[PDB]
Symmetry: D2
Subunit: 258 residues, 4 copies
């Protein structure tokens, strides 16, 4: 596999639906050794099961809201992985009220702070915490959405948070590049996940994208998985600070329904 010899930490595996689940399956297929985080105790058991089906018993708590939890993650991981080769940030949150209605009516200071803190800051927070553990040739990866570039109904403040996160990719790639670390994002098209369900009229976005995307289907966690595996491998040694659209080309289409 093109990840033979790599040790990648994967965040954000909530279920078999999760983008991060797809990424893990592809990275295991390509020979990566994997470790896994879980947000809270409620999620531990399922992530342990998913971890074990991929030959891993490295499963550790991380609530990215808490600096101590991020430090503890890497404190505990260092004991099995003194050094490793990067991680997948597949984590977003905003209060539910932020994702239904007029952006300006519905956005709040606290909704804004949480969305950016959890979806944007958490990525560089994780990087600070493991910086000295990363081998030369390491790769970090986050997940963004066209909401960052365009005004999308109901996505609302998550658009601002993804725009922040995509700038984070750039500032992180620029800072960590010299010492041999690449940083990228996948801008993924719509996929049915627990989190997707939190966006008002998600199913309308999903249907619309299926119709007008050049490849004429919604992308799968397999498609994202393979792209993510590639971006965290030495195959992508020439790419850093990049937001790669894995949306079937939806972002480049205009006026297809009239």
């Amino acid at each position: 596999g093109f990840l033979s010899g790599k040790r990648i930490l994967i965040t954000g595996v909530a279920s078999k639906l999760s983008i991060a689940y797809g990424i893990a399956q592809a990275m295991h297929r390509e020979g990566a050794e994997l470790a896994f985080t879980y947000q809270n105790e409620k999620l531990k058991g399922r992530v342990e099961e998913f971890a074990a089906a991929l030959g891993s018993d490295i499963v550790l708590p991380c609530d990215v809201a808490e600096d101590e939890s991020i430090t503890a993650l890497f404190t505990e991981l260092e004991k099995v992985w003194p050094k490793f080769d990067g991680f997948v940030h597949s984590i977003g949150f905003a209060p539910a009220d932020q994702l239904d209605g007029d952006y300006v009516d519905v956005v709040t200071r606290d909704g804004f702070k949480i969305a950016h803190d959890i979806s944007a800051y958490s990525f560089v927070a994780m990087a600070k915490a493991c910086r000295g553990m990363l081998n030369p040739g390491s790769a970090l990866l986050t997940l963004s959405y066209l909401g960052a570039e365009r005004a999308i109904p109901n996505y609302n403040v998550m658009g601002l948070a993804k725009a922040s996160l995509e700038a984070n990719v750039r500032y992180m790639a620029n800072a960590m590049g010299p010492e041999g670390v690449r940083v990228n994002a996948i801008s993924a098209g719509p996929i049915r996940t627990l989190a997707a369900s939190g966006i008002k009229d998600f199913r309308k976005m999903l249907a619309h994208c299926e119709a007008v995307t050049p490849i004429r289907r919604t992308v799968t966690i397999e498609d994202v998985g393979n792209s993510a595996a590639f971006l965290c491998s030495n195959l992508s040694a020439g790419i850093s600070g990049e937001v790669v659209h894995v949306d079937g080309g939806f972002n480049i289409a205009a006026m297809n329904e009239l």
Copy 2:
């Protein structure tokens, strides 16, 4: 005066000194016939801002600390007393703790540092829009000030780059939300200009010199260049333009591989 903003009432935030981008905008809007009102952050800036306002024929000078929801509500409660309706506002406000703007981004970025940059530099634009939405006339325009740091990794600009990316996305979401009721929302991506707050960016004087050398117009932009651009974007001349980040940087942003 009389000009392309005759009939417009515009609120101006972020005047600190005569170097301030908001001063150049205030100058340019007065010259084009706008009635102006001003905000000041704290008591330290009140007196300075009052004399600037009086020189431009305004005695509407009101406190606003955009970290505080109470302060923004009270701004527009007081503003309503003299201006029941008005035609929008200029958001010329940035802030991060000093420690954010000096060193390797990953090393010096902090959670509070990130929180404060995004809160003051990005959230505060839509906060002001939420609290004055009902007072905006049809044909109103909101304007904010961004920087190329939103688009490119700039040494030492660090977490302000992310807060500016968030700001530019806010322009788009607000434009989209407010367009149907007749409100336009735009940004100017200004080139570097020696302002009080600019002195806080490590190596600013090298940015300035770099930008002077490679910018197509072969000069630094002025608060006059930005003021004329802001005056246009808040005027009915710009009626076909919403959700845009207009680069007023002499075209620095389109240059690569110079020298």
Copy 3:
């Protein structure tokens, strides 16, 4: 006096009262410009003479941008009445009709691609080459582009490629001509019913779509584009070069609005 007082601006692409260039001409004359006009061929000469006369000009000269000799003769004739001037509006676009109906790969041809690029993109720099010595300090060039440059729009086809080339032309001309005091910008205009627009398949559906989903909830007008164009060729926009300004009511920044 208007913000174009003391400027001498040459206007191409006036075909009718619906032409973008005619809206530009009106706004620029309103703001105090003195104007000169080109006409493509003998059939348009009379109408352009009439529209120019209505804006206080009888400087009305043939220019077919297909021909190097025609562009040279234009500036050799112009110089006799305008030894110096302050820039020109390039409002010129053409591809063979067969290029703008069907699947882009089926319908695009080598000659169709050549003509689109030659007339719509190359002509902007050919004109700049031909008058470079006649431009005052503070001169400004303007071309017209379309969202088709950035996105794949059905049936705009190879005109999308020609517009992308044109916007790249804006950047390379801004960068080359900036040091000698010349600014170069584009307006990326929303759809407008003009003679040329009727050559685009389902243009009526395009208008209705942009009408529904554009933040400002209307079509832009030649007044909107004219006002922006006046601004971009005036000293008010002295800070802006190498820029494609979207004058499309925010259409470009909206996604999934139809639902």
Copy 4:
């Protein structure tokens, strides 16, 4: 390998430094059957040799200035490859005079025509001539440069031709997507190739990019090759109409003192 069972045609192999060389190596290594084109008789020997090193004896002429040359390529290719899974367009040309001096002084109608014709039109010309030979799941790839997005000294009219090429990618991705074909570009950082010599002060561009690129090195035909292999493989199934920057992140950097 992840191109196992794919048939890819490769253009623009000139020498061992050729981006198209790096791409052939990477695609061979991952188990693609390759075919190669050569511009003219002068290059035919070098390519027949490079092809044989990779196990291909499919080496056909194509001058993309000629519609007939493109038809004939696909007429000959069909005899051995009735179907195939796409091609790599690694082809650029402008008259030498275009790439030395101030853009406005140096550009000419004929300079502009050829740059656009060879560097941009030829990509969709090849897609037109082979559309019915492409299997479901096929990928086309072209090579672009940041000259499309930024004004770069001396790159001049090639910048416009690459901007047209990048738009081409999007219009081809939109048209061909529904019949199961993806179309993408790599925007490669500077690399010393035969063609690169043609740019005035190319050396300075290399050293500039090397100094300020986040990965702090020049990219290689093997970095571009790995990215090209990926983008023409089923691994990239969710990517179309995309210009992927393989320049070490140079494009996102500004103000490196």
